[PDB]
Each structure stands twice: as C-alpha cells, then as structure tokens.
C-alpha cells in the first residue's frame, strides 16, 4: 500500500526526507498561522536541543531545532518540517510559541533510505547515485512504501507518481548502485527482481559496471 509523499531533501549519504501529502494542508495552515503570529510578535535565548523558529532563505520563518551553537553568528539548526540544515546568525532565530509546537502538529519531515540497495562506498560513485536521485525526485511528489526497519532510519521503496516505476530499482537498472540482499522470505521476489536488473546492468556495462565486474 503506497502512500503519496513529497520528497524535500536528498542527503549525501543517499538518505532522503519526505512529507506525508495527507498532512500537507495542516502544515500549510500551521505555517500561515505561525507567520501571522510572528508578524505581530517580532523576534529568545538559543540553546542546544531547543526548538525555535528560524528564518530561511525565502525570507519566511519555519519550525526548527537548535543542534549546535558555534558562536553568536553561527547557530546550526535543523528544519523539522523539511529536513534541511542551516547555519545562521541570531537575527534569524526566534521563540517557537507553544501554539505551534510538535504536540500541536508533529515534525513533518521523516528520514528514510532505499530498501534493497547499498549506498556506494566510493565517493564519486555515491555522488553519481545521489545526483541521479536529486534530478529525478528532489522536490517532487512520489509514492512510498515502508519495507523494513533498521539500526538507523527505516528503509522504503519509492515509485514515480506518473510511471509508477520503482526509483531504487531504476538506480540498480542504471548500474548506479548494487543490490543489498535480505533474508526475509517476503522480500525474496523483489530482491530477485533487483538482482535480475543488477545482472542486466552489469551485462550492459553501465556506471559501476562500465569496465566489467
């Protein structure tokens, strides 16, 4: 059962943040109400671990968490509803009012990784894979299915909204990533399909397999 999500950020480690489309309206409303409240209560003592508001590069305020105070000019924040990080001065920080807390609406961005694929260890190969995914899915609406948990973030399959093509499988087909085998019996059909695409990618001498195997 695939659910619609909006992909916000792709990380250099081939993880990615998504927002649930079903709650997009609620996020929009919260932001509208938060900003109306900020406009009347113009910007707090930033400290590590604390929630705040932070003024992004579009000139708008968003919900954030303080991760590191490097100096008064360099406060490291994480935008809880989008997943991007930013270093900013104190002039771009404010109090997050209780009316807009994560109890009122949960953090809207969730970190995921692709199921059944290995993130390339070679730096340039990993860049090629990241770059593909950025071009194809960053800031677009996709379909998502949670496959399995891990000692880390959950792993998922994504589908393109239009073609319904499996995104991670696309990477394997292109020879941009290798397959990550799992033992669960319910994953055997999909893993066999991924291994089949990988072998075909190897025979076509694409990307990772350009010079053979």
């Amino acid at each position: 059962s695939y659910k619609p999500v909006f992909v916000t950020e792709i990380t250099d480690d081939l993880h990615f943040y998504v927002q649930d489309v079903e709650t997009g309206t609620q996020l929009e409303k919260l932001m509208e109400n938060m900003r109306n409240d900020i406009a009347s209560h113009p910007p707090y003592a930033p400290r590590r671990g604390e929630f705040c508001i932070a003024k992004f590069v579009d000139g708008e305020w968003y919900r954030a968490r303080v991760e590191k105070v490097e100096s008064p000019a360099k406060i490291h924040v994480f935008y809880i509803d989008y997943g991007n990080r930013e270093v900013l001065p104190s002039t771009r920080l404010g109090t997050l009012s209780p009316a807009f807390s994560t109890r009122v609406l949960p953090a809207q961005a969730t970190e995921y990784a692709f199921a059944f694929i290995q993130v390339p260890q070679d730096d340039d190969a990993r860049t090629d894979a990241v770059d593909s995914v950025v071009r194809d899915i960053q800031n677009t609406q996709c379909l998502l299915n949670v496959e399995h948990l891990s000692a880390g973030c959950p792993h998922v399959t994504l589908q393109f909204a239009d073609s319904k093509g499996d995104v991670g499988l696309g990477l394997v087909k292109e020879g941009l990533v290798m397959v990550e085998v799992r033992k669960e019996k319910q994953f055997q059909k999909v893993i066999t399909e991924y291994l089949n695409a990988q072998e075909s990618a190897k025979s076509a001498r694409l990307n990772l397999w350009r010079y053979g195997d």
Binding site: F6, Q19, G24, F56, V57, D58, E60, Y82, N139
Partner: peptide
Amino acid sequence: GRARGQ
C-alpha cells in the same frame, strides 16, 4: 510552493 522557491 512546496519547493519553497528552491
């Protein structure tokens, strides 16, 4: 506007 102008 989901891309935030980006």
